[PDB]
Design a protein around this ligand. Structure first.
Ligand SMILES: Cc1ncc(C[n+]2csc(CCOP(=O)(O)OP(=O)(O)O)c2C)c(N)n1
Ligand SMILES: Cc1ncc(C[n+]2csc(CCOP(=O)(O)OP(=O)(O)O)c2C)c(N)n1
Ligand SMILES: [Mg+2]
Ligand SMILES: [Mg+2]
Lengths: 557, 556
């Protein structure tokens, strides 16, 4: 009772709630894709290019747990490389599957099709090894089932990319289907009691001794499923709690102890002080600190920092390998109320929930928009924002509870969010078809990955594509080169993008005024994810949220 | 008298006749880019994405000698890699330049310890690398990089920290060129090679000449033309070298493509007992659609690199110089040949209605009526790559078919780069592109960049409702070979074009009304020609061989 290894892979991917398969076909993955259509539940997105496909996989994996992209040897896998790199950097389980020529007999199939010339056919594997948690290149059908299972486990558990090469000749070879009747084991190994024990007691004594602590949640908080444990910590301590831009949504923001988003130097004065004055910081799922961008500087003042991570825990300079975020937090939640004992709940910072009313002819400005979006959002929504003026603006928006944010702030691939929006939309559809996916992308970033809108159209997905037209690269104009050619772009007809890519059931509308915006976003028809929609939001050419142009004068000579 | 290292770099690129510069602005190359507008006669393309930029740079270098793309640390360089990788495979001098951060400690985008990973990666697909850390050496290093790029015609990685580009060095340096010459061979090796070849020619009952890409690429175009005049052996071209032999020469026999060639040509080559190959990329390689190899082992490969005979590599023997020595004594050595008459493709089509629906085999013949000396002809992996092989190329046609590395989307970019290079060579030199409905989706946005720089290429899009080469080699009706449907005609105005033409052609007459029209024939504005075509239609050779190869039990 036997199935192909092709079939075997997809059946395993289905058992881990992975239903949509990303990539483009090529010379050596065709038979493999044949297998998708034999598995009730699966489907082939069939993307517009391999980078967009990887970005989409990033986005799917963020919502769903993990994701799969398939490319062909050489031309394919190398096109995805930057997509994977950002996935590696922001800890996102993408399984990258690459079909390759037959391991034949003197590898004489593998060698002839290898057109790169240097006679070394492993080069592309090597290359991906650098930006993968592990790799695998199946040469042996007897080990293939357990190797695949391993590749999948590692993707889901470590939440980082994994390279898995399947030679064409092996995806048609067969195994026992019986194998599928035992699940892939995705459980975490329990912690070392000696190190856990010792971590906890160090952490409690740090709390006990602390006059002004803060809690701070980052990307891995969500990624490694510790939202509940983090909420409990906030609850049991009543400490002031913050999110970084990249774990926005990891704390339900209607919580009275939640004090908004820390963005180092771009933070609002109140929040900057709330965090920088802290004599102890409890980082959950920190995605490194003390790091810079060309627009902001992120770090804390205290050295009295406790980072929980998936792999390990960190306390001041001490490192405790195999002391795992989830279990460590669970254990802490037993003694922690008591260590918190003598904390006096200071009230904390709040952004304004609402914009004061103005004339409906009022020109749209970014500071205004980022607030007004607070009014449009509903619980369950997915909000995606591009590196740009968006990635710093959505930081002041009040999110309903149960709202996932996608903001690839650390790696900072632009155009990322177009592909991410595809993946996020496929996953939402699979999770709950009433779940809205809202994208905020600048007109300039959109050019890099524009064609993956075709692929949204093709599956009649219904994301809202909000396109901030402010005539160019407006954040890279605020730091260096205000009026250089290299931060100028061609002016596209954003409203014709959907029709041009063959959309038959869409809406496409410009908004330039406060009143235009309100008429569109309060329309109950619009508020329901009925068809795919694009909104061209017109903004001034040197506009930005207010704490960014804080640092056009006050840290640029 | 002093200039920033930045300016030195651009001043060196001008001296080598690089005028357009490719890539996207980044966190750590902005300072570098500032310099460009101060060197007169230099421009920044402003590409729509990095991969596109690399493809453009490829196209540029193919025409203008060499090229330069600037990306930024991590996000930029890695986005460009598939582009660099093909430049490496098909031997094209692209200088990849990455602005990186400035002897820092924390800025690292990834999240290991490792400032060096993306350089390690680009090493695997570069002739050399260079990560400049010290001002005193940097000019010397830049020159090596630019030299190596040009001389070897393979891409080179050049990492430039942000601190050093604003540091400053003496203008005087520019007053010496860069050494872009070779040095004649070691005459010991040359003689040994030339001799055995001349011998082999005498013994050769029926020799043949192959030009491959490195023939254009390393300037051996003319030497090939004499050699064919003197040996009057049948001459042929690889799909990668089409246009290296001007196709009017009596003894030019068309395009050898291994298992996909025209029966007459397949016969001509498979039965030679000596192959004189000028500038092979690969002798013996496969793709999904065909299989390349000669039948003799009695093969001479001339490269710039080396010379090779049967199994014997003679490192040293440079293909340009060496070929002159053969030119002399060959006149003699070969004059016991009985000139075998050379195969031909239909040079014109048979008259038919004007309502006769368009068909690939018709199109590729007809294209020959539209072309003209000086033209540039670009063909994308897919039906278009194979179709053009049938087309008759006017003298001094330059061809770009990326048939070895075979990355779809390549062309949209290469088209931009070529049109920049074209412009800088001759206003009136047209740039013509055939690309599939499906390939275009991968790289469609680089059209914006064409519009913006007021370039006027011809963009023939083959609209055959999907990936049709793919359908012919597995999955004729598979959803994965289908593609979302685009208003191709609306693509220009939608990317904000103003001086533009966009027309559909469905029928043999419609194609004629358009390509015969005199104004069309002038590179006045950017034009896009949607060519309607049956889904499963394709050059008749390739329909055969996609059946043949599926009829055998023999495998991959
Ligand atoms: C792949 C890549 N290339 C270049 C950059 C550098 N970069 C960062 S932001 C930016 C401008 C983004 O444009 P847009 O979305 O229009 O910004 P807005 O006007 O909304 O701020 C650029 C060019 C990058 N991050 N990634
Ligand atoms: C980057 C990349 N992705 C995927 C492939 C595999 N591939 C080869 S040909 C092809 C289809 C080309 O489509 P189209 O241009 O319509 O071809 P035509 O209809 O002219 O044959 C694909 C997807 C590739 N060669 N390169
Ligand atoms: Mg913009
Ligand atoms: Mg096509």
């Amino acid at each position: 009772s036997e199935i192909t290894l092709g079939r075997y892979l997809f059946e395993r991917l289905k058992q881990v709630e992975v239903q949509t398969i990303f990539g483009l076909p090529g010379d050596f993955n065709l038979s493999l894709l044949d297998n998708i259509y034999e598995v009730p539940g699966m489907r082939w997105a069939g993307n517009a290019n391999e980078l967009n496909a990887a970005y989409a996989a990033d986005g799917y994996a963020r919502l769903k747990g993990m994701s799969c992209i398939i490319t062909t040897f050489g031309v394919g896998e190398l096109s995805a490389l930057n997509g994977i790199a950002g996935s590696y950097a922001e800890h996102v389980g993408v399984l990258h599957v690459v079909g390759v020529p037959s391991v034949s007999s003197q590898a004489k199939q593998l060698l002839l099709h290898h057109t790169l010339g240097n006679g070394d056919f492993t080069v592309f594997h090597r290359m991906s090894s650098n930006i993968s948690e592990t790799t695998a290149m199946i040469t042996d059908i007897n080990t293939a089932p357990a190797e695949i299972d391993r590749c999948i486990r590692t993707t889901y558990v470590s939440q980082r990319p994994v390279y898995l090469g399947l030679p064409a000749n092996l995806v048609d070879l067969t195994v026992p289907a019986s194998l599928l009747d035992t699940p892939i084991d995705l459980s975490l190994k329990p912690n070392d009691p000696e190190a856990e024990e010792e971590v906890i007691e160090n952490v409690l004594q740090l709390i006990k001794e602390a006059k002004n602590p803060v809690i701070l949640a980052d990307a891995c908080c969500s990624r490694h499923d510790a939202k509940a444990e983090t909420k409990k910590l906030i609850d049991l301590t009543q400490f002031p709690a913050f999110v970084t831009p990249m774990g926005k949504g990891s704390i339900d923001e209607k919580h009275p102890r939640f004090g908004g988003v820390y963005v180092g130097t771009l933070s609002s004065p109140a929040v900057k002080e709330a965090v920088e004055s802290a004599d102890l910081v409890l980082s959950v799922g920190a995605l490194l600190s003390d790091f810079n961008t060309g627009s902001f500087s992120y770090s804390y003042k205290t050295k009295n920092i406790v980072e929980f991570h998936s792999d390990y825990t960190k306390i001041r300079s001490a490192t405790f390998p195999g002391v795992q975020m989830k279990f460590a937090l669970q254990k802490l939640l037993t003694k922690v109320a008591d260590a918190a004992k003598g904390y006096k709940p200071v009230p904390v910072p709040s952004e304004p929930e609402h914009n004061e009313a103005v004339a409906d002819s009022t020109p749209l400005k970014q500071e205004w928009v980022w607030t007004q979006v607070g009014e449009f959002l509903r619980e369950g929504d997915v909000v995606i924002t591009e590196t740009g003026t968006s990635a710093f603006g959505i930081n002041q928006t009040h999110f309903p509870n149960n709202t996932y944010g996608i903001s690839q702030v650390l790696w900072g691939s632009i155009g990322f969010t177009t592909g991410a929006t595809l993946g996020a939309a496929f996953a939402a559809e699979e999770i709950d078809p009433k779940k809205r996916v809202i994208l905020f992308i600048g007109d300039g970033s959109l050019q890099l990955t524009v064609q993956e809108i075709s692929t949204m159209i093709r599956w009649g997905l219904k994301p809202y594509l909000f396109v901030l037209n402010n005539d160019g690269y407006t954040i890279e104009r605020l730091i260096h080169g205000e009026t250089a050619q290299y931060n100028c772009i061609q002016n596209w007809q954003h409203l014709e993008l959907l029709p041009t890519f063959g959309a038959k059931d869409y809406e496409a509308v410009r908004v330039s005024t406060t009143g235009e915006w309100n008429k569109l976003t309060t329309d109950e028809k619009f508020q329901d994810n009925t068809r795919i929609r694009l909104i061209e939001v017109m903004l001034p050419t040197m506009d930005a949220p207010s704490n960014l142009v804080k640092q056009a004068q006050l840290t640029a000579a």
